[PDB]
Amino acid sequence: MNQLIQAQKKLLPDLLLVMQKRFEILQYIRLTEPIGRRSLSASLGISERVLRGEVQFLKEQNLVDIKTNGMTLTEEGYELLSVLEDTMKDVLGLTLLEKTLKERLNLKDAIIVSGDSDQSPWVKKEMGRAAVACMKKRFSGKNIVAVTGGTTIEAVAEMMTPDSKNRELLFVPARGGLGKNQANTICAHMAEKASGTYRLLFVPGQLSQGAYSSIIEEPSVKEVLNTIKSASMLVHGIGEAKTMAQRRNTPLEDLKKIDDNDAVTEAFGYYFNADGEVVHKVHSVGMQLDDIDAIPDIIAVAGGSSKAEAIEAYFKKPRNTVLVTDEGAAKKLLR
Amino acid sequence: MNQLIQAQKKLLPDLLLVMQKRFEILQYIRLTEPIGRRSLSASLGISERVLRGEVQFLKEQNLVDIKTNGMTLTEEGYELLSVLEDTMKDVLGLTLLEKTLKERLNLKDAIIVSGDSDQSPWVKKEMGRAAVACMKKRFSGKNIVAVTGGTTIEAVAEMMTPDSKNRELLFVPARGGLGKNQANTICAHMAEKASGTYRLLFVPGQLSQGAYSSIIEEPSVKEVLNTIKSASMLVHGIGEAKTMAQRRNTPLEDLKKIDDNDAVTEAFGYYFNADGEVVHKVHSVGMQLDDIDAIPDIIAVAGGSSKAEAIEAYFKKPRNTVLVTDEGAAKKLLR
Amino acid sequence: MNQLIQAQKKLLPDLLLVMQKRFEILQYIRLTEPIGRRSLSASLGISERVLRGEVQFLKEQNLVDIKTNGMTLTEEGYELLSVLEDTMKDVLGLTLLEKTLKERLNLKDAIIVSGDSDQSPWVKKEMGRAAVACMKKRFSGKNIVAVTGGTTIEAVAEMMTPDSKNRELLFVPARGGLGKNQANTICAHMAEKASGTYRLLFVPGQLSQGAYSSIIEEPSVKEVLNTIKSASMLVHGIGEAKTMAQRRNTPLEDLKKIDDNDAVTEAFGYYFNADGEVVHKVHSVGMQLDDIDAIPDIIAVAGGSSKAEAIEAYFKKPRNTVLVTDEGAAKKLLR
Amino acid sequence: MNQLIQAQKKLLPDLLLVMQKRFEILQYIRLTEPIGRRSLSASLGISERVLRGEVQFLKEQNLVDIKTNGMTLTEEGYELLSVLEDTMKDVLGLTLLEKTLKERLNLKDAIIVSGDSDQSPWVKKEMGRAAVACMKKRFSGKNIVAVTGGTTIEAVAEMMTPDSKNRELLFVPARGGLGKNQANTICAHMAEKASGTYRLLFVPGQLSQGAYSSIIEEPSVKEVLNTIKSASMLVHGIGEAKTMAQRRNTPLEDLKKIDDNDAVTEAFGYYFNADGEVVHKVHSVGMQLDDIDAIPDIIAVAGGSSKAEAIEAYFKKPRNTVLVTDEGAAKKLLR
DNA sequence: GCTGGACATTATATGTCCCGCTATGACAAAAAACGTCCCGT
DNA sequence: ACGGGACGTTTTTTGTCATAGCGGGACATATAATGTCCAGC
């Protein structure tokens, strides 16, 4: 099969280009259906008339249905996306790129989707799709999944679907949250979408450690913290440090600490410098950096060209993590 | 008859109002005939122009004769008035029931919808509808609305619609919540449904007072607590005490306190005995019982036959509150 | 309740008119959803702007949902149609009309829907709705339902829904059919819509009796004929004789017989004169006129002003049948 | 590889054609280099203008050198041609398989789709797709298409689309049917899907020949039978004999006849032995085996490994038929 | 014996715009309701 | 005293339409593919 694909790349690149453009149309319909030719052509970079030619082809092949409210995929369309998913990435050049990103960073594996999410918002949804598919490959019979609360993890929640294998799924918020995109919100949304269950907490924000210790000393609370300690999976974002610290209600004393110690990246309530060393921790009830070592599966979902530096810094140390990212970030990092 | 009227009010919301007004006109004519439009309007406190239109309508229906010396009933009018004497007490067993519930309980007003929500789940939605309509009549130009997190208040949130008058609406959670129906969830849902804004908090549960005091001492937190203190409206549920205490993670020491002091009702984090005296408070960051005095508008939404005793106990003291309830609770309380 | 309704008809006829117009909007949405204000206003006799006022009211009462593809009923809308169904007919004047139609014709009962299906095509769908509801009230634990193949029975099939009581339902074609609206087609469509089962036959048309007798003598065939003989219900149309005979491939000899014997009505393969006496039978394998006597439930579904004479003639003899018809036919017959 | 190619053909229907044509150009250059565009076009029977475009493309892909004295392969070209020698027999195991199936069976042509429909249900839909495309290539200006009623022909009907050339299409049922998948049902569904017209009949089943003769003697009936006799196309299935005879209501006398005469295959109401000789005919009004000779286009659609023996037996005699089948059947037959 | 260049014809894709559908708002105008208030009978 | 008439004001409903997105459709034009033919080196 690899021999066939390599021969096709030399003898039929003109045909491979048409196929990729038509495959991209099917992916964007899967994301946004039902959608009409005006909105879909605008969403891609192409004229209504060019799209209308391609969509009429796809309808004739019974891959899309065209109704008064727009276009949706047929069963054959959904099947085709699953069958061609991996080989299409070989010609998109993502395969070689993922190999190299894994040589460069401390990564268990790299999953890169097309595009730059800083330019093309829907790319966050494709990272979401990819992350969900990755989660499902790693689930055991029973699972406790800890999640953070940022907008990329929200995109993972939005793309979550029930598990075909019906494995047991309990979701909890490792980050606790700061303000509606708080880990509790995400945790619940992801569980509803997966037909799983979930457990919840309070918003930590920034407070005296003694106040957190009293919450930690509490029983019904302790039960949720022990569940978080037992997490089998962590799904988290990676942010720019300054962006995260200004978005939160960071005390002026801690802003100065964060700046003076040259923080560049943020993940699950910690700020790290360019060498991936912790420089500040926003105290929260729940997961600690030392706890990630014992979690079998960690999936970081983060992309966009603006995050290349943060992503590089975070993975300057081994994290035993699979990264789901996009070309925006990966190409900027690697060239 | 109750079922028919409840269906008819969906198409004709002030059906009972028109019925009652026309019935009163016919009663007053039977008492004073012949009487003219000037005397009849004055006696009923209706504008002459409105009364003149209604009696001209009744004359077209052959119920009243309009002659040189004024108005008298027809044969048809006397017969109809005799039929309405029987029906209309059954037609208006409600304005009668609400009048009596307000004589019995400490209530600013009573709003009672048909049915028993313990038997007929959709009755919770009609309490919701009624509560929303009540809220909108009480809004000022600017509003801070504090809400609790129980399933009946959830029903109020589900029926919330944007304000026709576009008054300013900020929602906050007075109860803070305990576990997905936490006041924060409700508060947000209600704000989205109203196209208002909202502010949020952490879940208190049961914890040491000192831990809460540290959260109270905090700044970005203090701002939300001060907003709650400035509430112009409170919308809250009323629960059975034992049900509420067992649903929560109540400490065994506090369960014994609650039982030993004969708590029967619960509202906004307080348990009260049969005389409406506080017997226990689940400590929470936010509203205190003493704070309700200063809130201009308080609406309690609670019904079902199982809550009759709790509702009676809660209103054994003046609360300056409008109660939205159902026949389930009201009829069980009053007979 | 009857006292309340009679008082409402005298005191509130202006309010009853508004309610009926809004109820008619809900009925036509149930039939055609999703539908938009341009198509729905045209379907009724009213301007887009008048409809838009009423539909905005219905949305505010949570009886309809308005989406990009048009309007549908909410749960509350479907419920309201079931609760008000019978009382709305009292003011539509259908109750008095049905009483009189049953005094005039040989009828077990009369069910009359509004309108004239000759003028307003959707009236055939409301006869369909009414017939289905009637069938479901008469089902026993086990049912064999024989059906004819005309366009009004097709409308019954289109409105068929699964039985809430999950009674056993087997459908068969009593008429056998003549040409795509053949009883076999209807029989199958009705069974699929009811989640029942069905058995089938060949199209008789017009042929020598001996050819039919050979088909009757056959075994796998005999089993279906015996099933038809065991029918617990018959659902059939009533047609004008000349229309039915010309639509079919009637032999010229039989056309002359039909004309010369003054046939005026047709039902299940028989032509009858003005006194309801058989004058000609299109020979078919299956049900015979003598067999209807032994069928517990017979429902005739037929309407439109053009059928008044045929309907009157058919019921000049006792048929122990419930007629589902429309005002078109009923008012023309009775005045 | 089979799965990848089948997916790729949905986006690029003549992928294998382009592949093969480019492979042949490279083979012919390796044999004759240096060779010019006039000689190479002549030798391959391709127009000089088309060949010139393909070799200019191959030169841009660095596979061929175009010099004053003509064209030679590059290093890359020799390597690619060596890879394609291995792949392309696996890439084109099909045009090879169809060639061989046509050497083995009595076939006008063979069309084989990937997979085994006994294992993979969707393979019946791809046979359907292929059969429709074949039908459309054979249509004349006016067409009478006779069809049988089995589940594979149903799959052909489901994939039917209107004719791009808008040729005239009338469909009729050659098989008449036995029980909802009766030829009449299929015939109608196919006509609706093609925007054609159709004519229909009764279900023959098994009956005395004299009863059929009376139906044959009839006029409006005779017109449909004469239309079937005028068929320009027949589209039929092929079944296992025992399966077909047990599915129908076969008389015990005829089952014994079918068994005792070693029937193995069934098509259009006839059972045949392993040598393709008729051993029993289920009498039906319509097409007879002798009639197929006069039909210009016959397309048999049948596949799955369980039908290999039936398919082989049916085509032991010349039928002037194009077979649409799958690898399931073809590979089992040929190895 | 070939390179590229090229001209006339035929086929396919594209641009443009189009009519007939669905939702939100939005301004103007007409009708209805109403608050007093006039007279004669 | 009481009803009919009525005028000015206020409130509510209606008419007209306005546009983005949804489709299948039509007409015109451009771009490309194709079928040969051109020269000299």
Side-chain angles (χ1 to χ4, degrees):
Chain A
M1 182 178 74
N2 173 55
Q3 199 180 248
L4 174 58
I5 287 154
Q6 296 316 126
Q8 284 183 342
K9 280 200 225 187
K10 291 168 170 96
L11 190 73
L12 301 179
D14 54 331
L15 261 61
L16 290 194
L17 258 298
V18 171
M19 168 170 340
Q20 277 172 242
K21 296 180 166 191
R22 286 183 187 157
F23 192 76
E24 178 185 25
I25 291 168
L26 293 173
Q27 301 263 50
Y28 297 21
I29 293 171
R30 177 165 48 175
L31 275 191
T32 58
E33 50 180 33
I35 191 172
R37 67 174 191 240
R38 171 176 220 63
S39 312
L40 184 56
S41 55
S43 151
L44 302 156
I46 65 169
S47 80
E48 185 155 328
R49 176 50 100 166
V50 169
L51 182 55
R52 184 173 177 181
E54 295 302 346
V55 148
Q56 190 59 33
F57 171 74
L58 294 176
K59 177 194 160 143
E60 285 154 29
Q61 303 298 95
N62 302 133
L63 301 177
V64 314
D65 275 337
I66 306 177
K67 302 293 194 60
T68 86
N69 67 325
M71 299 170 281
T72 56
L73 296 187
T74 63
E75 195 192 9
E76 295 176 32
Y78 286 111
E79 287 164 341
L80 201 69
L81 288 175
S82 71
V83 178
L84 293 177
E85 57 188 288
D86 269 333
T87 74
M88 272 322 110
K89 315 161 158 56
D90 276 301
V91 190
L92 283 153
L94 296 167
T95 298
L96 283 193
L97 203 74
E98 294 170 341
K99 173 178 172 308
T100 308
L101 192 66
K102 179 176 177 186
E103 279 165 357
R104 173 75 173 258
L105 302 178
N106 287 278
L107 289 176
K108 190 180 256 290
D109 274 318
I111 295 169
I112 302 166
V113 305
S114 308
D116 183 0
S117 54
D118 282 358
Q119 298 297 305
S120 295
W122 77 81
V123 172
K124 188 166 296 184
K125 304 177 162 172
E126 295 298 337
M127 265 187 289
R129 203 197 298 275
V132 169
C134 182
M135 291 169 68
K136 289 184 178 171
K137 264 172 152 198
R138 306 308 308 172
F139 292 147
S140 300
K142 294 183 173 216
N143 305 273
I144 294 176
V145 181
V147 306
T148 59
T151 63
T152 302
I153 308 311
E154 198 151 29
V156 178
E158 189 68 22
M159 303 303 287
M160 180 57 67
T161 62
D163 180 24
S164 70
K165 291 193 192 181
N166 198 20
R167 291 162 290 190
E168 181 165 350
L169 300 172
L170 164 65
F171 298 83
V172 292
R175 193 177 84 93
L178 188 147
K180 183 190 183 69
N181 60 338
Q182 290 116 0
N184 274 358
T185 310
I186 298 299
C187 179
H189 183 219
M190 195 179 293
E192 302 180 20
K193 282 264 219 298
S195 300
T197 53
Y198 63 102
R199 302 302 170 250
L200 286 203
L201 256 181
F202 85 97
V203 299
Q206 185 64 60
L207 177 63
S208 86
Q209 154 69 94
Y212 290 108
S213 64
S214 64
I215 294 169
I216 290 152
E217 277 159 1
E218 289 330 282
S220 58
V221 173
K222 188 180 293 189
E223 197 191 343
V224 178
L225 298 169
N226 284 337
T227 296
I228 297 167
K229 207 179 152 270
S230 66
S232 59
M233 179 176 293
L234 170 64
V235 182
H236 74 86
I238 300 171
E240 297 185 77
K242 279 217 179 187
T243 304
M244 292 303 298
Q246 293 177 335
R247 192 174 292 175
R248 293 159 167 168
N249 288 337
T250 314
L252 280 182
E253 277 203 28
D254 298 328
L255 283 168
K256 179 154 174 183
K257 181 184 172 176
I258 292 173
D259 191 48
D260 279 3
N261 288 285
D262 303 316
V264 298
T265 185
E266 189 279 343
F268 47 86
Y270 285 85
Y271 298 84
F272 309 81
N273 65 16
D275 291 325
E277 306 163 334
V278 173
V279 295
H280 180 65
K281 169 189 197 307
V282 175
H283 315 318
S284 178
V285 297
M287 196 181 286
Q288 299 190 327
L289 180 62
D290 295 342
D291 303 333
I292 61 171
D293 309 333
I295 303 177
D297 290 288
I298 307 167
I299 299 167
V301 192
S305 47
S306 73
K307 290 192 177 176
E309 299 69 35
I311 287 168
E312 190 180 336
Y314 179 69
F315 295 108
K316 277 292 181 160
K317 307 287 208 193
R319 308 290 186 192
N320 200 45
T321 291
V322 167
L323 173 65
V324 178
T325 194
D326 59 10
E327 284 182 302
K331 286 181 179 175
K332 173 156 181 160
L333 201 154
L334 295 165
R335 293 182 183 174
Chain B
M1 252 193 49
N2 289 332
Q3 282 156 33
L4 183 48
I5 284 152
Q6 159 213 68
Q8 282 179 336
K9 275 196 254 185
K10 295 180 182 297
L11 295 191
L12 282 174
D14 52 45
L15 179 83
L16 293 191
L17 277 198
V18 171
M19 269 190 110
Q20 185 63 39
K21 172 192 68 207
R22 287 190 191 163
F23 167 73
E24 280 203 320
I25 293 168
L26 288 177
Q27 290 192 307
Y28 206 97
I29 294 176
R30 176 184 57 202
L31 184 76
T32 59
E33 47 182 36
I35 188 176
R37 73 180 186 232
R38 297 171 178 79
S39 309
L40 184 58
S41 50
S43 295
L44 294 169
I46 300 299
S47 87
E48 177 193 323
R49 204 57 151 110
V50 175
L51 180 276
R52 185 176 172 173
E54 292 293 314
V55 303
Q56 178 58 31
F57 176 74
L58 296 178
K59 178 258 174 85
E60 286 165 9
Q61 303 325 305
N62 190 66
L63 300 181
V64 177
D65 277 338
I66 300 175
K67 285 160 54 144
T68 304
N69 66 329
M71 305 169 281
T72 175
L73 292 194
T74 61
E75 51 177 21
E76 284 205 37
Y78 281 110
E79 287 164 344
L80 173 61
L81 184 56
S82 184
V83 170
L84 296 174
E85 307 225 88
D86 190 338
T87 59
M88 178 148 317
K89 293 179 179 179
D90 289 345
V91 175
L92 188 147
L94 295 174
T95 299
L96 295 174
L97 203 74
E98 294 170 341
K99 173 178 172 308
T100 308
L101 192 66
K102 179 176 177 186
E103 279 165 357
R104 173 75 173 258
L105 302 178
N106 287 278
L107 289 176
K108 190 180 256 290
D109 274 318
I111 295 169
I112 302 166
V113 305
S114 308
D116 183 0
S117 54
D118 282 358
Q119 298 297 305
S120 295
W122 77 81
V123 172
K124 188 166 296 184
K125 304 177 162 172
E126 295 298 337
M127 265 187 289
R129 203 197 298 275
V132 169
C134 182
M135 291 169 68
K136 289 184 178 171
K137 264 172 152 198
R138 306 308 308 172
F139 292 147
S140 300
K142 294 183 173 216
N143 305 273
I144 294 176
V145 181
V147 306
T148 59
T151 63
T152 302
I153 308 311
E154 198 151 28
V156 178
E158 189 68 22
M159 303 303 287
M160 180 57 67
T161 62
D163 180 24
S164 70
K165 291 193 192 181
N166 198 20
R167 291 162 289 190
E168 181 165 350
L169 300 172
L170 164 65
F171 297 83
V172 292
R175 193 177 84 93
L178 188 147
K180 183 190 183 69
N181 60 338
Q182 290 116 0
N184 274 358
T185 310
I186 298 299
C187 179
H189 183 218
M190 195 179 293
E192 302 180 20
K193 282 264 219 298
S195 300
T197 53
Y198 63 102
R199 302 302 170 250
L200 286 203
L201 256 181
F202 85 97
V203 299
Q206 185 64 60
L207 177 63
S208 86
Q209 153 69 94
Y212 290 108
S213 64
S214 64
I215 294 169
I216 290 152
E217 277 159 1
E218 289 330 282
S220 58
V221 173
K222 188 180 293 189
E223 197 191 343
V224 178
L225 298 169
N226 284 337
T227 296
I228 297 166
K229 207 179 152 270
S230 66
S232 59
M233 179 176 293
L234 170 64
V235 181
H236 74 86
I238 300 171
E240 297 185 77
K242 279 217 179 187
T243 304
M244 292 303 298
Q246 293 177 335
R247 192 174 292 175
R248 293 159 167 168
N249 288 157
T250 314
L252 280 182
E253 277 203 28
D254 298 328
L255 283 168
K256 179 154 174 183
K257 181 184 172 176
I258 292 173
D259 191 48
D260 279 3
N261 288 285
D262 303 316
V264 298
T265 185
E266 189 279 343
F268 47 86
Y270 285 85
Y271 298 84
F272 309 81
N273 65 16
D275 291 325
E277 306 163 334
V278 173
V279 295
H280 180 65
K281 169 189 197 307
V282 175
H283 315 318
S284 178
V285 297
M287 196 181 286
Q288 299 190 327
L289 180 62
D290 295 342
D291 303 333
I292 61 171
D293 309 333
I295 303 178
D297 290 288
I298 307 167
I299 299 167
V301 192
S305 47
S306 73
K307 290 192 177 176
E309 299 69 35
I311 287 168
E312 190 180 336
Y314 179 69
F315 295 108
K316 277 292 181 160
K317 306 287 208 193
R319 308 290 186 192
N320 200 45
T321 291
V322 167
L323 173 65
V324 178
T325 194
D326 59 10
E327 284 182 302
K331 286 181 179 175
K332 173 156 181 160
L333 201 154
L334 295 165
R335 293 182 183 174
Chain C
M1 182 178 74
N2 173 55
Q3 199 180 248
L4 174 58
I5 287 154
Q6 296 316 126
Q8 284 183 342
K9 280 200 225 187
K10 291 168 170 96
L11 190 73
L12 301 179
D14 54 331
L15 261 61
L16 290 194
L17 258 297
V18 171
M19 168 170 340
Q20 277 172 242
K21 296 180 166 191
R22 286 183 187 157
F23 192 76
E24 178 185 25
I25 291 168
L26 293 173
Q27 301 263 50
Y28 297 21
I29 293 171
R30 177 165 48 175
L31 275 191
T32 58
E33 50 180 33
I35 190 172
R37 67 174 191 240
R38 171 176 220 63
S39 312
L40 184 56
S41 55
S43 151
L44 302 156
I46 65 169
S47 80
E48 185 155 328
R49 176 50 100 166
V50 169
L51 182 55
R52 184 173 177 181
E54 295 302 346
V55 148
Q56 190 59 33
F57 171 74
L58 294 176
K59 177 194 160 143
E60 285 154 29
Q61 303 298 95
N62 302 133
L63 301 177
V64 314
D65 275 337
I66 306 177
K67 302 293 194 60
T68 86
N69 67 325
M71 299 170 281
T72 56
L73 296 187
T74 63
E75 195 192 9
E76 295 176 32
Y78 286 111
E79 287 164 341
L80 202 69
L81 288 175
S82 71
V83 178
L84 293 177
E85 57 188 288
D86 269 333
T87 74
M88 272 322 110
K89 315 161 158 56
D90 276 301
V91 190
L92 283 153
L94 296 167
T95 298
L96 283 193
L97 203 74
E98 294 170 341
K99 173 178 172 308
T100 308
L101 192 66
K102 179 176 177 186
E103 279 165 357
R104 173 75 173 258
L105 302 178
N106 287 278
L107 289 176
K108 190 180 256 290
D109 274 318
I111 295 169
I112 302 166
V113 305
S114 308
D116 183 0
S117 54
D118 282 358
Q119 298 297 305
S120 295
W122 77 81
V123 172
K124 188 166 296 184
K125 304 177 162 172
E126 295 298 337
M127 265 187 289
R129 203 197 298 275
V132 169
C134 182
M135 291 169 68
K136 289 184 178 171
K137 264 172 152 198
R138 306 308 308 172
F139 292 147
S140 300
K142 294 183 173 216
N143 305 273
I144 294 176
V145 181
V147 306
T148 59
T151 63
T152 302
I153 308 311
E154 198 151 29
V156 178
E158 189 68 22
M159 303 303 287
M160 180 57 67
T161 62
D163 180 24
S164 70
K165 291 193 192 181
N166 198 20
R167 291 162 290 190
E168 181 165 350
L169 300 172
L170 164 65
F171 297 83
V172 292
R175 193 177 84 93
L178 188 147
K180 183 190 183 69
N181 60 338
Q182 290 116 0
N184 274 358
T185 310
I186 298 299
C187 179
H189 183 219
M190 195 179 293
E192 302 180 20
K193 282 264 219 298
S195 300
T197 53
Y198 63 102
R199 302 302 170 250
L200 286 203
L201 256 181
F202 85 97
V203 299
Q206 185 64 60
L207 177 63
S208 86
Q209 153 69 94
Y212 290 108
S213 64
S214 64
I215 294 169
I216 290 152
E217 277 159 1
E218 289 330 282
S220 58
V221 173
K222 188 180 293 189
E223 197 191 343
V224 178
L225 298 169
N226 284 337
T227 296
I228 297 167
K229 207 179 152 270
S230 66
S232 59
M233 179 176 293
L234 170 64
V235 181
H236 74 86
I238 300 171
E240 297 185 77
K242 279 217 179 187
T243 304
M244 292 303 298
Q246 293 177 335
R247 192 174 292 175
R248 293 159 167 168
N249 288 337
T250 314
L252 280 182
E253 277 203 28
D254 298 329
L255 283 168
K256 179 154 174 183
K257 181 184 172 176
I258 292 173
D259 191 48
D260 279 3
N261 288 285
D262 303 316
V264 298
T265 185
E266 189 279 343
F268 47 86
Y270 285 85
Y271 298 84
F272 309 81
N273 65 16
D275 291 325
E277 306 163 334
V278 173
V279 295
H280 180 65
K281 169 189 197 307
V282 175
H283 315 318
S284 178
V285 297
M287 196 181 286
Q288 299 190 327
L289 180 62
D290 295 342
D291 303 333
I292 61 171
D293 309 333
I295 303 177
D297 290 288
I298 307 167
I299 299 167
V301 192
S305 47
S306 73
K307 290 192 177 176
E309 299 69 35
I311 287 168
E312 190 180 336
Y314 179 69
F315 295 108
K316 277 292 181 160
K317 307 287 208 193
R319 308 290 186 192
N320 200 45
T321 291
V322 167
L323 173 65
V324 178
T325 194
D326 59 10
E327 285 182 302
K331 286 181 179 175
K332 173 156 181 160
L333 201 154
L334 295 165
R335 293 182 183 174
Chain D
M1 252 193 49
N2 289 332
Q3 282 156 33
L4 183 48
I5 284 151
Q6 159 213 68
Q8 282 179 336
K9 275 196 254 185
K10 295 180 182 297
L11 295 191
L12 282 174
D14 53 45
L15 179 82
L16 293 191
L17 277 198
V18 171
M19 269 190 110
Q20 185 63 39
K21 172 192 68 207
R22 287 190 191 163
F23 167 73
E24 280 203 320
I25 293 168
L26 288 177
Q27 290 192 307
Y28 206 97
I29 294 176
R30 176 184 57 202
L31 184 76
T32 59
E33 47 182 36
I35 188 176
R37 73 180 186 232
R38 297 171 178 79
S39 309
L40 184 58
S41 50
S43 295
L44 294 169
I46 300 299
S47 87
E48 177 193 323
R49 204 57 151 110
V50 175
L51 180 276
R52 185 176 172 173
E54 292 293 314
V55 303
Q56 178 58 31
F57 176 74
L58 296 178
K59 178 258 174 85
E60 286 165 9
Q61 303 325 305
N62 190 66
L63 300 181
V64 177
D65 277 338
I66 300 175
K67 285 160 54 144
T68 304
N69 66 329
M71 305 169 281
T72 175
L73 292 194
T74 61
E75 51 177 21
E76 284 206 37
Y78 281 110
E79 287 164 344
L80 173 61
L81 184 56
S82 184
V83 170
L84 296 174
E85 307 225 88
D86 190 338
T87 59
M88 178 148 317
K89 293 179 179 179
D90 289 345
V91 175
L92 188 147
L94 295 174
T95 299
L96 295 174
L97 203 74
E98 294 170 341
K99 173 178 172 308
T100 308
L101 192 66
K102 179 176 177 186
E103 279 165 357
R104 173 75 173 258
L105 302 178
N106 287 278
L107 289 176
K108 190 180 257 290
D109 274 318
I111 295 169
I112 302 166
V113 305
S114 308
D116 183 0
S117 54
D118 282 358
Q119 298 297 305
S120 295
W122 77 81
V123 172
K124 188 166 296 184
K125 304 177 162 172
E126 295 298 337
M127 265 187 289
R129 203 197 298 275
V132 169
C134 182
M135 291 169 68
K136 289 184 178 171
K137 264 172 152 198
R138 306 308 308 172
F139 292 147
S140 300
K142 294 183 173 216
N143 305 273
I144 294 176
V145 181
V147 306
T148 59
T151 63
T152 302
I153 308 311
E154 198 151 28
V156 178
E158 189 68 22
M159 303 303 287
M160 180 57 67
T161 62
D163 180 24
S164 70
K165 291 193 192 181
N166 198 20
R167 291 162 289 190
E168 181 165 350
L169 300 172
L170 164 65
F171 298 83
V172 292
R175 193 177 84 93
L178 188 147
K180 183 190 183 69
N181 60 338
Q182 290 116 0
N184 274 358
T185 310
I186 298 299
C187 179
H189 183 218
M190 195 179 293
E192 302 180 20
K193 282 264 219 298
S195 300
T197 53
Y198 63 102
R199 302 302 170 250
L200 286 203
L201 256 181
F202 85 97
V203 299
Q206 185 64 60
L207 177 63
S208 86
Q209 153 69 94
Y212 290 108
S213 64
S214 64
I215 294 169
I216 290 152
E217 277 159 1
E218 289 330 282
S220 58
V221 173
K222 189 180 293 189
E223 197 191 343
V224 178
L225 298 169
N226 284 337
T227 296
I228 297 166
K229 207 179 152 270
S230 67
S232 59
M233 179 176 293
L234 170 64
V235 182
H236 74 86
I238 300 171
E240 297 185 77
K242 279 217 179 187
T243 304
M244 292 303 298
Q246 293 177 335
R247 192 174 292 175
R248 293 159 167 168
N249 288 157
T250 314
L252 280 182
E253 277 203 28
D254 298 328
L255 283 168
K256 179 154 174 183
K257 181 184 172 176
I258 292 173
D259 191 48
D260 279 3
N261 288 285
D262 303 316
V264 298
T265 185
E266 189 279 343
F268 47 86
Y270 285 85
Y271 298 84
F272 309 81
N273 65 16
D275 291 325
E277 306 163 334
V278 173
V279 295
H280 180 65
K281 169 189 197 307
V282 175
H283 315 318
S284 178
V285 297
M287 196 181 286
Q288 299 190 327
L289 180 62
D290 295 342
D291 303 333
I292 61 171
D293 309 333
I295 303 178
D297 290 288
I298 307 167
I299 299 166
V301 192
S305 47
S306 73
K307 290 192 177 176
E309 299 69 35
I311 287 168
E312 190 180 336
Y314 179 69
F315 295 108
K316 276 292 181 160
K317 306 287 208 193
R319 308 290 186 192
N320 200 45
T321 291
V322 167
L323 173 65
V324 178
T325 194
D326 59 10
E327 284 182 302
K331 286 181 179 175
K332 173 156 181 160
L333 201 154
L334 295 165
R335 293 182 183 174

